[PDB]
């Protein structure tokens, strides 16, 4: 993935205190159907879906070596080809060829 997408990779986590911390008590009740009336809070109802692309709904831990969101080893943060590449140098501590 591009370096311009690697700048989006940090813009997507920049709203954590701006939209995703001051209304978290509302976020726990905003869609609960055990409540009076059919409308009670419309002036705050949209404020945590009002931000787009930079939302927890698009947050993914991603390959720390390619920017790809899929097909990577979460214990290393990177894909099969970069585990292979390091194993040919013996470079990952305690990691050794065996099948038991």
């Amino acid at each position: 993935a591009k370096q311009s997408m690697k700048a989006r990779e940090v813009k997507r986590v920049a709203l954590a205190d701006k939209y995703f911390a001051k209304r978290a008590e509302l976020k726990a009740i905003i869609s609960d159907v055990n409540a009076s009336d059919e409308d009670r809070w419309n002036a705050v109802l949209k404020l945590q879906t009002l931000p787009r692309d930079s939302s927890p709904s698009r947050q993914r831990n991603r390959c720390r070596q390619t920017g790809r969101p899929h097909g990577f080893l979460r214990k290393f943060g990177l894909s099969r080809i970069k585990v292979r590449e390091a194993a040919m140098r013996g470079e990952i501590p305690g990691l050794k060829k065996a099948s038991w």
Binding site: R64, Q65, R74, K75, F76, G77, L78, I92
Partner: peptide, 9 residues
């Protein structure tokens, strides 16, 4: 094991 991916980075 939970920090190994950041140590490898």
């Amino acid at each position: 094991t939970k920090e190994f991916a950041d140590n490898l980075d």
